[PDB]
Design a protein around this ligand. Sequence first.
Ligand SMILES: *[C@@H]1O[C@H](CO)[C@@H](O[C@@H]2O[C@H](CO)[C@@H](O[C@@H]3O[C@H](CO[C@H]4O[C@H](CO)[C@@H](O)[C@H](O)[C@@H]4O)[C@@H](O)[C@H](O[C@H]4O[C@H](CO)[C@@H](O)[C@H](O)[C@@H]4O[C@H]4O[C@H](CO)[C@@H](O)[C@H](O)[C@@H]4O)[C@@H]3O)[C@H](O)[C@H]2NC(C)=O)[C@H](O)[C@H]1NC(C)=O
Ligand SMILES: *[C@@H]1O[C@H](CO)[C@@H](O[C@@H]2O[C@H](CO)[C@@H](O[C@@H]3O[C@H](CO[C@H]4O[C@H](CO)[C@@H](O)[C@H](O)[C@@H]4O)[C@@H](O)[C@H](O[C@H]4O[C@H](CO)[C@@H](O)[C@H](O)[C@@H]4O[C@H]4O[C@H](CO)[C@@H](O)[C@H](O)[C@@H]4O)[C@@H]3O)[C@H](O)[C@H]2NC(C)=O)[C@H](O)[C@H]1NC(C)=O
Ligand SMILES: *[C@@H]1O[C@H](CO)[C@@H](O[C@@H]2O[C@H](CO)[C@@H](O[C@@H]3O[C@H](CO[C@H]4O[C@H](CO)[C@@H](O)[C@H](O)[C@@H]4O)[C@@H](O)[C@H](O[C@H]4O[C@H](CO)[C@@H](O)[C@H](O)[C@@H]4O[C@H]4O[C@H](CO)[C@@H](O)[C@H](O)[C@@H]4O)[C@@H]3O)[C@H](O)[C@H]2NC(C)=O)[C@H](O)[C@H]1NC(C)=O
Ligand SMILES: *[C@H]1O[C@H](CO)[C@@H](O)[C@H](O)[C@H]1O
Ligand SMILES: *[C@H]1O[C@H](CO)[C@@H](O)[C@H](O)[C@H]1O
Ligand SMILES: *[C@H]1O[C@H](CO)[C@@H](O)[C@H](O)[C@H]1O
Lengths: 366, 366, 366
Amino acid sequence: NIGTGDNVLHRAALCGIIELAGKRAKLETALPNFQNELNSILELNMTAAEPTWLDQFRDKDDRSKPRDLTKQPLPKDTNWADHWTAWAKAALPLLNDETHQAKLKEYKLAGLQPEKLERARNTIRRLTAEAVAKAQDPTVAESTADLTTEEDLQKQINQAVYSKDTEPDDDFNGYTAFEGKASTNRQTICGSAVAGSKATNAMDALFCVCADDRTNGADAGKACVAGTAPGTGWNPGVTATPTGTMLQKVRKLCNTHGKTTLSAAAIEGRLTAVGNLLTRGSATSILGSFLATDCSGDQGSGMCVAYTEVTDAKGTPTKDIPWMQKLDSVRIKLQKHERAVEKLGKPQHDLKTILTLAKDPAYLQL
Amino acid sequence: NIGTGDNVLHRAALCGIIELAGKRAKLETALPNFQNELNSILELNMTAAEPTWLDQFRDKDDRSKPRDLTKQPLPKDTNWADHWTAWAKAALPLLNDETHQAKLKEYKLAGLQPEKLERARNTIRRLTAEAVAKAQDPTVAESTADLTTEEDLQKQINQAVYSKDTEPDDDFNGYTAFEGKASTNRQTICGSAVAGSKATNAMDALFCVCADDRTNGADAGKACVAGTAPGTGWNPGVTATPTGTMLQKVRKLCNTHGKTTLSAAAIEGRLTAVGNLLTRGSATSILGSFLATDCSGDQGSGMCVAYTEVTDAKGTPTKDIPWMQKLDSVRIKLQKHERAVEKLGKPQHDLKTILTLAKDPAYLQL
Amino acid sequence: NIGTGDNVLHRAALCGIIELAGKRAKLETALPNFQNELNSILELNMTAAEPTWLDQFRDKDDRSKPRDLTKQPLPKDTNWADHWTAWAKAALPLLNDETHQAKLKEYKLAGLQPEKLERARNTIRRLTAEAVAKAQDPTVAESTADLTTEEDLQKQINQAVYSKDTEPDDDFNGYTAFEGKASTNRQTICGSAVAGSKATNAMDALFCVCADDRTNGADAGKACVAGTAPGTGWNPGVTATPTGTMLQKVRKLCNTHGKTTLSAAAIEGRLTAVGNLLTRGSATSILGSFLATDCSGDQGSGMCVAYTEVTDAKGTPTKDIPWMQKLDSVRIKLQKHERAVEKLGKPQHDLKTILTLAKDPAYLQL
Ligand SMILES: *[C@@H]1O[C@H](CO)[C@@H](O[C@@H]2O[C@H](CO)[C@@H](O[C@@H]3O[C@H](CO[C@H]4O[C@H](CO)[C@@H](O)[C@H](O)[C@@H]4O)[C@@H](O)[C@H](O[C@H]4O[C@H](CO)[C@@H](O)[C@H](O)[C@@H]4O[C@H]4O[C@H](CO)[C@@H](O)[C@H](O)[C@@H]4O)[C@@H]3O)[C@H](O)[C@H]2NC(C)=O)[C@H](O)[C@H]1NC(C)=O
Ligand SMILES: *[C@@H]1O[C@H](CO)[C@@H](O[C@@H]2O[C@H](CO)[C@@H](O[C@@H]3O[C@H](CO[C@H]4O[C@H](CO)[C@@H](O)[C@H](O)[C@@H]4O)[C@@H](O)[C@H](O[C@H]4O[C@H](CO)[C@@H](O)[C@H](O)[C@@H]4O[C@H]4O[C@H](CO)[C@@H](O)[C@H](O)[C@@H]4O)[C@@H]3O)[C@H](O)[C@H]2NC(C)=O)[C@H](O)[C@H]1NC(C)=O
Ligand SMILES: *[C@@H]1O[C@H](CO)[C@@H](O[C@@H]2O[C@H](CO)[C@@H](O[C@@H]3O[C@H](CO[C@H]4O[C@H](CO)[C@@H](O)[C@H](O)[C@@H]4O)[C@@H](O)[C@H](O[C@H]4O[C@H](CO)[C@@H](O)[C@H](O)[C@@H]4O[C@H]4O[C@H](CO)[C@@H](O)[C@H](O)[C@@H]4O)[C@@H]3O)[C@H](O)[C@H]2NC(C)=O)[C@H](O)[C@H]1NC(C)=O
Ligand SMILES: *[C@H]1O[C@H](CO)[C@@H](O)[C@H](O)[C@H]1O
Ligand SMILES: *[C@H]1O[C@H](CO)[C@@H](O)[C@H](O)[C@H]1O
Ligand SMILES: *[C@H]1O[C@H](CO)[C@@H](O)[C@H](O)[C@H]1O
């Protein structure tokens, strides 16, 4: 008969999912953001430019103000319209002569007399072109496109766990278990050797695996605990949908008190830990202790949840069980984010190198 | 006594191995293949070369055909024999004047008058040398040598699972369990507190852990299932070797219906999940539920497989249990492939950068 | 009642921790050490330098000996004191004329007449500055600072497992279980539904989960084994602290015979495998099979260890359970080491590229 602790294995696997939800899943990768360095190189290039070049960025009446493109259109016989936004950004602080002199000092160009500035300028223009080619590389934008957001990933995880964008509070306000489709009795709600459950997410699966009910507190209702049953008071033969208080008495078996470092490997391990616990039969697969007939919560029956989507003849969880597919999508997105973070560290180092060289007066003359 | 579901833990661990076999393990890493970019840079270098240089690649009678190295030997006083294959490859389409002009346009060199082409040529020759130095780096060939193939990895995984290069079909055609050495009774086949099993791979270990037999369908034979026993009909006291139909009734408990993304971490976790389930005793270690004496399939004995290779005094699975060592070899190969993929993305980005610069007419003049 | 094999799940999880200790955890990452290449580039730069430059590194009396900085101070009107150590290192072998000629040959500079050496020198000085900028990048020292040592990581792991810098020998010499605080009886030592254990590390937790004692050899004392109980002889109602012989009879259930490749993912998986096995109650969480009251080792009570630090209302193991926090610290340090190894492969490849170019006579003239 099913008794105390018989579902500890399954509880652990499902809580490894639950604990990811809320805002607890964290992208601690940070990001290689090299825009600061690129902007500095472009500003250094403008600072070293011939004064008639910086003069193109000035208003013809107030030389301290930026050129307006209606008042002074960019000549059609140039490619200046393709490059103006970045040029004007680099020029804007330099329109102030005192700021231009301050930047000349910041970039180690203020000791240069005209012919020596001309020489350095050639090297700076070359380094600047190389910086743009490295940082504007379509592959850089490719990696940047594969960068995910903690908010987006957290939303998808809460969809897998709760079918909501956010984790329900401790009263489960706004949440209805089994999407309002619970009926009849525990075995109808949780499934059997022939029928699937009414669960659509990981939380409600955990509830079927771990909740006690009115009839099994002395025996099977202790399957996920030690000494004392959860005490849900669930009476599904009379009132099929458990209340929020009931759900929380099961969720509190899981660690909602810490954080998890999001990595594809971590998600993969957690999904496999559930997926291979599914006991594949002819018509359903069962998660949880099962002895006979159905997941009715009786000690001679089962404390479990059943799925028709995978059996001993078909189906993989990450494709065919919706909540698990949703979580596998997070693993996929994380793998791409991880590859992008690695790739983007290269232009970051390269831009730092170029800025070091561009600020080295001896190299520029060389 | 051993009964329904008592081996779910062990089944899950072993199915995490089985599911890797067949063609289901996938190298989704793809590869940084930068040959296209290197070839383009070399062709651009040849396109910009002085016409007497491209003329070295022509047949002396038909200037549209490539030079034959018997007819017109490469002068011994040059190093041209060290470089000819790559040069001739770059020159071949350019021997056609219309194609040479088309390539001049493709690479943004067709607007250049002779003295301006000479200037650009100097920069192109420098960028081309840098491209070769980055992409021919012995460390690039080092990483390329550490690139593995999905086919090779899949073969090794099937060796660990089945002792075959490929996964047996659903009738297990061509396969003999226990390599033909099964004899006597279940406990001789599967092992005991004193003797190791006759299994040599992961499939036949799973069979010992999970198969029902003629004597235990009502009790221990349900150790890996829910309601209904596998129904192998195995009668090892009479006919020791199980048939292919019998083997499949156990393999279908595992997910052979999806795919797994090959990573060293994923293999490592799956091996550890088996290895630390081995219950280490004085003379053998046991995988599966064991109560007394041996792995005979009796509910008072064990549903299990035994190994002499590791005990409470010696042995690590990834070195001393052959099937597990074979799988650990895949983890090792995957770790190197992963490091190589990371390293090779650097020359890929660098070559894209160089091609961007080489096609920028303003940079070339700079 | 708790009987044979009921704690195999928990044993496996805890042995996945124990097996990391000793010297068995291995940083097989190796390291990108590019100092050899940087030193060679700096020596090549000095080899190609004008002879009056190399003469600055000579003693004024014995031209074969290095300049002494008291005898011949570095002029205050230069920045030579900022660069001398690396310059003198590059110059030292070259003070010997025969060695200078040998290095000229090694670096492919010995065929160069004076005007051709002048041309090559310009390129070498430029490549050398680029090498320093790439390898002296503050981000390189940042990554190098995030490089961990196998010795440091191994020490922290032994602290989590044993509260010692090193793994106790097979007699547990120098080690006292429960830090000398064991008293009264097994349930006082190991904890209950209301009180935490006296364990302070992972080894002593494993002992509470897996040791037999004088009263349970026929039943609960077989929870972590197959046929034969560990045979500790522990009599905690009389002598509370187990002896070293007793401890070893439990540790030998774990794999202390192999090695583990240190990775953050591997540590993360092993911690989660323990943490989510903790059965969270109102006042304690329990690791191990528990039926009633306490972890007394009785078959009707529990074979387990209890923690007050996490419950169904608070606490995450990697922050609030000291031994687990200590191991989580290793995961954190490993993640940074892994990111640093990846980042540092970039300057390594770049320096190899530069050395290839600097040794290419045709490129230098270009
Ligand atoms: C770092 O800082 C440097 C400055 O130090 C900055 O350099 C500037 O780069 C831009 C972009 O490369 C240069 O833009 C060119 O500007 C010339 C000059 O235009 C003025 O003068 C002409 C002649 O008197 C006037 O006609 C014109 O109205 C302007 O007043 C333009 O002539 C260039 O346009 C031609 O080339 C483009 C390609 O680059 C074509 O797209 C365009 O259609 C033009 O081509 C036509 O003329 C060609 C003649 O040879 C002909 O071959 C074509 O077929 C076609 O008919 C171009 O816009 C600008 O001069 C640079 N500034 C200086 C002072 O040198 C860098 O941009 C900066 N780096 C970064 C990364 O920001
Ligand atoms: C990008 O595109 C460029 C072209 O724009 C291309 O450049 C070519 O590079 C190759 C390889 O560096 C150059 O090859 C050299 O060719 C000369 C010329 O040979 C002809 O003319 C001589 C003189 O009349 C004849 O004797 C000869 O038979 C040929 O007709 C050779 O002289 C060079 O060989 C010497 O140097 C080699 C080292 O590079 C030695 O290995 C070789 O033994 C030779 O050395 C001898 O002479 C030296 C004299 O100084 C002496 O010092 C040595 O001790 C020894 O006695 C060499 O083969 C070729 O000229 C370039 N082409 C042009 C038009 O400039 C790039 O290769 C391409 N980039 C890439 C990456 O593909
Ligand atoms: C690869 O190999 C090359 C050699 O091939 C090597 O190059 C050497 O680099 C160093 C560092 O850049 C150069 O150091 C400079 O040396 C000059 C020369 O000093 C002598 O001669 C002067 C004049 O007769 C004497 O006064 C002096 O006592 C020495 O005898 C110094 O003048 C330089 O110092 C000035 O510039 C520094 C900035 O680099 C300032 O920090 C310093 O205060 C000095 O500035 C003063 O003078 C300036 C005059 O223009 C003025 O503008 C300032 O405001 C200030 O008043 C400097 O120390 C050395 O010359 C190079 N060697 C050669 C032969 O060219 C590379 O270092 C090597 N690469 C690597 C990576 O190792
Ligand atoms: C589960 O199985 C038991 C035993 O057959 C049965 O009594 C229950 O009614 C069923 O739900
Ligand atoms: C396994 O153990 C049981 C109980 O001792 C025994 O009856 C069987 O014969 C043996 O194979
Ligand atoms: C553990 O629980 C059993 C059953 O109530 C009790 O008999 C023991 O004394 C206790 O330690």
